[PDB]
């Protein structure tokens, strides 16, 4: 090995290195202080004169004299294997469980090679969640990405925890489904409170999620460039598993807004002009870089489903982060401070919540017969039930007829029994029969979007 000493211009998070024309662009270096300590850094802006090393941590022990830099792993990769399904990491990929660090089966580049679209069929078999208001009204299918437009003060992380520890594919509605396929949950969390990291490790290790869920948890006080590199690590592990062993991989990306602010900080650090509202102009393609690595494949059997969760800043949707995510992904689900301060867990009001891929995904053979009719009927019924509920403050309850009194009792019982769940583990059949029990409160003949035979076959 060689060590590039003789370095000038240490400034902020950057430092220059004279006559290092061997560092390729995007090379990982380790900065050995004269005092025996080693930092990590990434090489940008190589020249014939000097290369630039951005430093992960704060530059504090450095000096112009006693500084050396050493190349390690000239493009950033990771060692990947299957045995790592209970192993916490932090961005880099150091184990933090106090357990033996693994040996590689492969050595994959952390950046994504994009998918040839001809090798992607359409995603058309579902995956339940446990959350009945997800799995009834606006379903999730294997391969789709759909975000959670969480509020800035709502419990997003409990929802991420519960859906990570509860969601399992069910093949017994399909064509003689076997359970030889495992189900890998890859869970990345970036820019997080210490308290909620302890909450996540408690929640994962309490119900046996830890046996089958790999974790990339890095904190806020970690360097921002590790928050850039973390979902690259999570998605290349997801791609390795699902496309090299034909698994079913659900990936959950906590707090994409932290990824956004780390991207903006590193853009302004590496000295380039920001664009819309002080954001980098390449945020769209860099955000597609870690969304569009999911899907299903013609020929293979894998399934990469991607739930990112993003905190909107103060609940607008023309902010650039939810604009790009609602402009890239397939639909959204949306939390609400209204229904949460009213007091319901999970706080999903569904009336702005929408999938754009349920139409291809559900149906007989796939999951169930009546599913789309139930979804549309409940959507329109709760839609006019909300407006009747806000109208009745003026009109007076006696001054409305029998039918809209039934609608208002429908909304009142609906938000108590269908949505309000807490930790109540529900599957899809209980979801449908509670949907029909709620729809029984409307009189028959009012159910105009459900054909007659389903009424005769399910009413109660």
């Amino acid at each position: 090995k060689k060590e590039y000493t003789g370095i000038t211009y240490i400034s902020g998070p950057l430092l220059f290195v004279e006559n290092a024309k061997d560092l390729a662009y995007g090379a990982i270096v380790d900065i050995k202080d004269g005092t025996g300590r080693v930092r990590g850094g990434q090489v940008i802006e190589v020249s014939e004169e000097y290369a630039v090393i951005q430093v992960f941590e704060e530059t504090t022990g450095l000096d112009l004299a006693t500084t050396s830099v050493s190349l390690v792993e000239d493009v950033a990769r990771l060692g990947v294997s299957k045995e790592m399904l209970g192993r916490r990491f932090n961005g880099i990929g150091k184990p933090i469980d106090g357990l033996p660090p693994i040996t590689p089966e492969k050595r994959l580049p952390i950046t994504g090679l994009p998918l040839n679209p001809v090798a992607r069929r359409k995603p058309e078999q579902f995956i339940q969640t446990g959350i009945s208001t997800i799995d009834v009204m606006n379903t999730l299918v294997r391969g789709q990405k759909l975000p959670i437009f969480s509020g800035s003060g709502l419990p997003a992380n409990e929802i991420a925890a519960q859906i990570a520890r509860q969601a399992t594919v069910r093949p017994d509605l399909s064509g003689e489904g076997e359970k030889e396929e495992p189900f890998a949950v890859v869970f990345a969390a970036m820019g997080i409170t210490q308290r909620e990291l302890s909450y996540f490790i408690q929640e994962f290790e309490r119900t046996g999620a830890l046996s089958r869920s790999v974790l990339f948890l890095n904190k806020a006080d970690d360097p921002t460039i590790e928050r850039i590199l973390t979902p690259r690590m999570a998605l290349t592990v997801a791609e390795y598993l699902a496309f090299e062993h034909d698994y079913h991989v659900l990936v959950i990306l906590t707090d994409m807004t932290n990824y956004c602010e780390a991207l903006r900080e590193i853009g302004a650090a590496r000295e380039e002009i920001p664009g819309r509202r002080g954001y980098p102009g390449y945020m769209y393609t860099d955000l597609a870089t870690i969304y569009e690595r999911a899907g299903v494949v013609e020929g293979k059997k894998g399934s990469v489903t991607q739930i990112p969760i993003l905190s909107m800043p103060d609940d607008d949707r023309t902010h650039p982060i939810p604009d790009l995510t609602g402009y890239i992904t397939e639909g959204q689900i949306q939390l609400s401070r209204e229904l949460h301060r009213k007091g319901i867990y999970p706080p999903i009001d569904p009336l702005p919540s929408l999938s754009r891929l349920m139409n291809n995904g559900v149906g007989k053979g796939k999951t169930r017969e009546d599913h789309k009719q139930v979804s549309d009927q409940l959507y329109s019924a709760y839609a006019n039930g909300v407006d009747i509920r806000k109208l009745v403050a003026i009109i007076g309850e006696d001054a409305l007829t029998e039918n809209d009194r039934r609608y208002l009792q429908f909304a009142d019982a609906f938000e108590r029994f269908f949505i309000n769940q807490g930790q109540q583990n529900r599957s899809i059949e209980e979801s449908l029969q509670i949907a029909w029990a709620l729809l029984s409160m409307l009189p028959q003949g009012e159910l105009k979007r459900i054909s007659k035979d389903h009424i005769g076959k399910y009413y109660g």
Binding site: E271, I273, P274, G275, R276, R277, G278
Partner: protein, 41 residues
């Protein structure tokens, strides 16, 4: 309805004005730093 659309559109355009000023100034200061890299010799 239209008065509130006019007010919201006016606030949008004055924020766009502020953003054009600041990207102009950052273009200027990047010009300064490139000029200073030239100035050192």
């Amino acid at each position: 309805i239209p008065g509130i659309r006019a007010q919201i559109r006016f606030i949008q355009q004055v924020l766009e004005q502020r953003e054009r000023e600041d990207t102009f100034r950052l273009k200027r200061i990047k010009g300064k730093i490139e000029a200073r890299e030239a100035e050192e010799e």
